Design an enzyme around this catalytic site. Structure first.
Site, PDB file in Angstrom:
ATOM      1  CE  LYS A  36      -4.070   2.167   1.868  1.00 31.11           C
ATOM      2  NZ  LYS A  36      -4.004   2.994   0.626  1.00 31.11           N
ATOM      3  CD  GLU A  85      -2.800 -13.064   4.563  1.00 28.56           C
ATOM      4  OE1 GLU A  85      -2.982 -12.523   5.689  1.00 28.56           O
ATOM      5  OE2 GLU A  85      -3.284 -14.173   4.257  1.00 28.56           O
ATOM      6  CE1 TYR A  86      -3.141 -11.212  -4.774  1.00 32.09           C
ATOM      7  CE2 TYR A  86      -1.802 -13.203  -4.842  1.00 32.09           C
ATOM      8  CZ  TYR A  86      -2.757 -12.379  -5.401  1.00 32.09           C
ATOM      9  OH  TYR A  86      -3.336 -12.732  -6.586  1.00 32.09           O
ATOM     10  CB  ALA A  87      -6.540 -11.598   0.188  1.00 30.33           C
ATOM     11  CG  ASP A 130     -17.477   0.910  10.613  1.00 34.60           C
ATOM     12  OD1 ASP A 130     -16.775   1.624  11.362  1.00 34.60           O
ATOM     13  OD2 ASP A 130     -17.426   0.977   9.366  1.00 34.60           O
ATOM     14  CG  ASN A 135     -12.871  -2.058   4.629  1.00 37.30           C
ATOM     15  OD1 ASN A 135     -12.432  -1.565   3.586  1.00 37.30           O
ATOM     16  ND2 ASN A 135     -13.459  -1.331   5.572  1.00 37.30           N
ATOM     17  CG  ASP A 148     -11.193  -2.629   8.701  1.00 36.72           C
ATOM     18  OD1 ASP A 148     -10.486  -2.938   9.680  1.00 36.72           O
ATOM     19  OD2 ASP A 148     -12.428  -2.827   8.691  1.00 36.72           O
TER      20      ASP A 148
HETATM   21  C1  LIG Z   1      -2.653  -2.377   7.529  1.00 36.54           C
HETATM   22  C2  LIG Z   1      -3.603  -3.444   6.941  1.00 36.54           C
HETATM   23  C3  LIG Z   1      -4.428  -2.907   5.725  1.00 36.54           C
HETATM   24  C4  LIG Z   1      -3.790  -2.267   4.632  1.00 36.54           C
HETATM   25  C5  LIG Z   1      -4.553  -1.798   3.541  1.00 36.54           C
HETATM   26  C6  LIG Z   1      -5.935  -1.980   3.557  1.00 36.54           C
HETATM   27  N1  LIG Z   1      -6.739  -1.485   2.463  1.00 36.54           N
HETATM   28  C7  LIG Z   1      -6.831  -2.097   1.292  1.00 36.54           C
HETATM   29  S1  LIG Z   1      -6.122  -3.488   0.822  1.00 36.54           S
HETATM   30  C8  LIG Z   1      -6.591  -3.755  -0.695  1.00 36.54           C
HETATM   31  C9  LIG Z   1      -6.301  -4.749  -1.580  1.00 36.54           C
HETATM   32  C10 LIG Z   1      -5.611  -6.088  -1.354  1.00 36.54           C
HETATM   33  C11 LIG Z   1      -5.856  -7.154  -2.255  1.00 36.54           C
HETATM   34  C12 LIG Z   1      -5.229  -8.379  -2.063  1.00 36.54           C
HETATM   35  N2  LIG Z   1      -4.403  -8.558  -1.051  1.00 36.54           N
HETATM   36  C13 LIG Z   1      -4.130  -7.594  -0.177  1.00 36.54           C
HETATM   37  C14 LIG Z   1      -4.713  -6.334  -0.308  1.00 36.54           C
HETATM   38  C15 LIG Z   1      -7.529  -2.590  -1.107  1.00 36.54           C
HETATM   39  O1  LIG Z   1      -8.075  -2.460  -2.189  1.00 36.54           O
HETATM   40  N3  LIG Z   1      -7.678  -1.566   0.138  1.00 36.54           N
HETATM   41  C16 LIG Z   1      -8.456  -0.386   0.121  1.00 36.54           C
HETATM   42  C17 LIG Z   1      -7.672   0.682  -0.697  1.00 36.54           C
HETATM   43  O2  LIG Z   1      -6.716   1.331   0.175  1.00 36.54           O
HETATM   44  C18 LIG Z   1      -7.272   2.455   0.913  1.00 36.54           C
HETATM   45  C19 LIG Z   1      -6.566  -2.600   4.648  1.00 36.54           C
HETATM   46  C20 LIG Z   1      -5.803  -3.070   5.731  1.00 36.54           C
END
Ligand SMILES: CCc1ccc(/N=C2\S/C(=C\c3ccncc3)C(=O)N2CCOC)cc1
Length: 247
Positions: A36, A85-87, A130, A135, A148
């Site tokens: 991120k 982590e990658y989901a 929430d 998320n 989240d």
């Molecule tokens: C600190 C933990 C965290 C970091 C970012 C987060 N927001 C995430 S993670 C994400 C996609 C993703 C797909 C596959 N594997 C992993 C992530 C995603 O699309 N968001 C929201 C956009 O950022 C504000 C949510 C939680």
């Protein structure tokens, strides 16, 4: 102790208000992950810089199969990076859109996976706010993953009445998510924020005819206006409808 140069950056996995999340790989280990990218100048303007530090410190101490792991973090001149982590299987929200509504098995299993994650946190003195299906991410075996910044030591839909009028927030959310899963939209959806407010406050909502007794019972008990009326996580996990239907 990481650097951007340690990673190969693939395509974006999501686009946020404060920057994108990218599929990434660690060069030395070939470890696949998500990165991120938050912009510093953009973070200061919004003044969320302190909340972020506090959030990262909390998350990093969290290890559970249904919580998206934060492996670490780093920064350079202009940006801050979070190593996640990658989901691989996308969001529950995306799955809902494709299926319209989940059956009882999928719902009950997801509620179980959620209650477990919250139980782990409640035993470590961590509380969540929430939870939105946007998320909620999915692992390779289709397991659910809370992803989240809502841990502690927007749209109104998922917020309980004791928070919009100014703990037990977690349990309200499960009620909302369980309803949304079985129905296809959350129980207080309105066309304006101010209407949703009024629906939540009164707990004004109805079930479609297909929602069964056991589901009505759990949702109805979870969506009590009075927080002290809501069941314990242990009661949720041992609700007849959950046990009859989950994995
Ligand atoms: C600190 C933990 C965290 C970091 C970012 C987060 N927001 C995430 S993670 C994400 C996609 C993703 C797909 C596959 N594997 C992993 C992530 C995603 O699309 N968001 C929201 C956009 O950022 C504000 C949510 C939680």
């Amino acid at each position: 102790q990481w650097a951007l140069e340690d990673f190969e950056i693939g395509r974006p996995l999501g686009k946020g208000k404060f920057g994108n999340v990218y599929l990434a790989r660690e060069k030395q280990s070939k470890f696949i992950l998500a990165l991120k990218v938050l912009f510093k100048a953009q973070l200061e303007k919004a003044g969320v810089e302190h909340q972020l530090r506090r959030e990262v410190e909390i998350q990093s101490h969290l290890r559970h199969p249904n919580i998206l792991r934060l492996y670490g973090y780093f920064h350079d001149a202009t940006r801050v990076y979070l190593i996640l982590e990658y989901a691989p299987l996308g969001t529950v929200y995306r799955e809902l859109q494709k299926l319209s509504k989940f059956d009882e098995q999928r719902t009950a299993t997801y509620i179980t996976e959620l209650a477990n994650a919250l139980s782990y946190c409640h035993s470590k003195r961590v509380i969540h706010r929430d939870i939105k299906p946007e998320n909620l991410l999915l692992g390779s075996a289709g397991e659910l993953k809370i992803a989240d910044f809502g841990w502690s030591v927007g749209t109104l839909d998922y917020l309980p009445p004791e928070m919009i009028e100014g703990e037990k927030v977690d349990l309200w959310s499960l009620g909302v998510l369980c309803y949304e899963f079985l129905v296809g939209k959350p129980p207080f959806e309105a066309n304006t924020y101010q209407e949703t407010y009024k629906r939540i406050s009164r707990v004004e909502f109805t079930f479609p005819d297909f929602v069964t007794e056991g589901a009505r019972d759990l949702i109805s008990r979870l969506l009590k206006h009075n927080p002290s009326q809501r069941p314990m996580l242990r009661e949720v996990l041992e609700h007849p409808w959950i046990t009859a239907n989950s994995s």
